[PDB]
From a paper:
Human enteropeptidase (hEP), also known as enterokinase, is an essential enzyme in food digestion and is localized at the brush border of the duodenal and jejunal mucosa. Activated hEP can stimulate the conversion of trypsinogen to trypsin via cleavage of a specific trypsinogen activation peptide, namely Asp-Asp-Asp-Asp-Lys (DDDDK), which is highly conserved in vertebrates. However, the mechanism of hEP activation remains to be established. hEP contains a multi-domain heavy chain and a catalytic light chain, linked by a disulfide bond. The light chain is homologous to trypsin-like serine proteinases with a typical Asp-His-Ser (D-H-S) catalytic triad responsible for peptidase activity.
Since the SEA domain has been shown to be dispensable for the enzymatic activity, a further truncated hEP including only residues 182–1019, i.e., also leaving out the SEA domain, was used for further high-resolution structural analysis. The resulting purified hEP was a heavily glycosylated single-chain zymogen with a molecular weight (>130 kDa) higher than that theoretically predicted of the amino acids alone (95 kDa). Cryo-EM single-particle analysis of this inactive hEP yielded a cryo-EM reconstruction at 3.8 Å resolution, with the resolution of the core region reaching 2.7 Å, allowing explicit visualization of side-chain density of most residues except for those of surface loops L1, L2, and LD in the peptidase domain. The LDLR, CUB, and MAM (LCM) domains were observed to protrude from the remainder of the hEP-core region, which containing the CUB2, LDLR2, and SRCR domains of the heavy chain and the peptidase domain of the light chain, resulting in lower local resolution likely due to high flexibility of the LCM relative to the core region. The CUB2 and SRCR domains were interconnected by the LDLR2 domain, and clamped the peptidase domain with a total interaction surface of 1163.2 Å2.
Author numbering: 519 to 1019
Amino acid sequence: ELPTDCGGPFELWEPNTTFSSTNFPNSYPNLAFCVWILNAQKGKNIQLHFQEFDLENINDVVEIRDGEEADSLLLAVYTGPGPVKDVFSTTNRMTVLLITNDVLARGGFKANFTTGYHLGIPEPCKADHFQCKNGECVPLVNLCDGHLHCEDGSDEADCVRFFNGTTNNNGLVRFRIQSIWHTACAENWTTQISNDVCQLLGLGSGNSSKPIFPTDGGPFVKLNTAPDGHLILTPSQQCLQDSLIRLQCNHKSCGKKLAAQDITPKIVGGSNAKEGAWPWVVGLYYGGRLLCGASLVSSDWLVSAAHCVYGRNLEPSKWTAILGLHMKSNLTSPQTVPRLIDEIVINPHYNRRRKDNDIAMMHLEFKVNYTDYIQPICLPEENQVFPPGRNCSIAGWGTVVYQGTTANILQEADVPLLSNERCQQQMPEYNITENMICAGYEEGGIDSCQGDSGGPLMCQENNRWFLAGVTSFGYKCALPNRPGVYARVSRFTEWIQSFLH
Ligand SMILES: *[C@@H]1O[C@H](CO)[C@@H](O)[C@H](O)[C@H]1NC(C)=O
Ligand SMILES: *[C@@H]1O[C@H](CO)[C@@H](O)[C@H](O)[C@H]1NC(C)=O
Ligand SMILES: *[C@@H]1O[C@H](CO)[C@@H](O)[C@H](O)[C@H]1NC(C)=O
Ligand SMILES: *[C@@H]1O[C@H](CO)[C@@H](O)[C@H](O)[C@H]1NC(C)=O
Ligand SMILES: *[C@@H]1O[C@H](CO)[C@@H](O)[C@H](O)[C@H]1NC(C)=O
Ligand SMILES: *[C@@H]1O[C@H](CO)[C@@H](O)[C@H](O)[C@H]1NC(C)=O
Ligand SMILES: *[C@@H]1O[C@H](CO)[C@@H](O)[C@H](O)[C@H]1NC(C)=O
Ligand SMILES: *[C@@H]1O[C@H](CO)[C@@H](O)[C@H](O)[C@H]1NC(C)=O
Ligand SMILES: *[C@@H]1O[C@H](CO)[C@@H](O)[C@H](O)[C@H]1NC(C)=O
């Protein structure tokens, strides 16, 4: 008997600034979903400063968005008591959604925004410097010089990239020094430095190099070796019968298992996974309780579902990432590696009401070494399509019922892929967007459940296990004709690669 109230302060202009929920110094109504659209002038952002904030737990949240149109962004998801940071917008419209539960009504929030030109983002400094990602600017002599100057490392990042590359794993060797880009030569190019250059680019070893001729007027730089392991770029423009380096680099540690497994046919009735059969499956415990799994994509980064970390991102220290998790009742094994979380980044295009863009990055506390039972998952390459009917394996600790006991050992099962058209024909309730992929049997039996959220949809391709899905939502478990819908990682590859660097 508590319906969502409609008719609150939707449109808020410039003089009308000091807004708040209904009866702010009191208890707000439960099951309320209110929206405070913050209109502004064309060319001014929104700066919201919460004067007093004391909400309920993760059950009730305040979601701040910067939509301005049908496709809404995501700025912050605040919850819990205590002061919060001032959200800095980028457009003239900000949506403040108040998601509430049915019980435990807390006090409420109150804020006063302000419209200005590029608020939050600091003013750009003099043009003779290079601005980092945090707004601070450093002199041009301090970028790409082998010494970290930016707080995040923007001066020493993206100092070399592929040029004239037919694929994302080869091309030229254009370096950047003193804020100018230029190619290299092949007079003294060996194999001992090729793998080093490939590692600097964020790739594997060097396959081969095909120097032909120079075609650009850039001041190509000579490259030599060094006994201390430093790629020296001798500043000079003088070379006879030169040639641009067409360097070919291999991929990084991809989805290659290192355990000694056997062959066992199990399609219908998938049993437990052997110790070390899925090294890129990471567990996430929030206060001594597994909620949603994660996929190891780098040495310190994890990809998890955005619906379980929704509201639990304010305090990343409460999470605990268990790498090499095999049994839920025995963590004293030498293969289990515990780590903490220090940063949780939710996808900007996430939408809990549409279950779209369900993906989230989680930074680890300390970097973890790769072992025989811990290996990173392999991100799918750009412009890669997975055909339907492809039997891809999954992994997780799903429970047979909502409030029962889950499997102690890691469970795994193979499910075939489905097209979006047939999936929508099978699920007339939900909404299947162009960033989702459905997989599962229409006859039931092999179906995911709670506890497998964020689990990877591992599809093997040329002896390599890629990442073709992240668990987003699903209907009731143990029901036929209800395939699991996962977030299509192929559409979020660049968003993850922008953070892995
Ligand atoms: C603020 O809102 C009230 C009603 O919500 C409206 O009458 C008024 O014109 C708005 N602007 C002000 C007070 O500057
Ligand atoms: C909100 O609180 C008061 C307004 O009474 C003001 O001093 C403060 O600067 C405001 N913060 C903003 C507008 O971000
Ligand atoms: C290679 O680089 C040259 C620059 O001189 C450019 O004109 C050309 O389009 C690039 N690609 C190919 C395939 O030649
Ligand atoms: C480059 O290659 C030539 C070829 O003999 C060699 O004499 C020279 O020592 C190498 N290094 C430099 C810096 O020229
Ligand atoms: C290099 O590329 C080829 C494909 O042409 C591949 O077979 C090989 O494994 C790669 N690595 C090495 C070291 O040859
Ligand atoms: C947990 O694993 C260790 C090492 O594998 C083993 O010694 C211990 O007996 C296990 N715990 C239980 C309850 O079996
Ligand atoms: C991981 O690799 C580093 C690099 O040498 C090493 O110092 C460390 O002992 C290794 N093991 C762990 C648990 O960090
Ligand atoms: C999936 O498994 C079934 C079981 O017989 C098989 O017929 C089908 O070919 C498999 N799909 C792929 C892509 O291997
Ligand atoms: C999602 O909902 C819209 C209505 O806003 C509808 O037009 C669309 O067909 C739905 N998506 C699917 C896959 O049916």
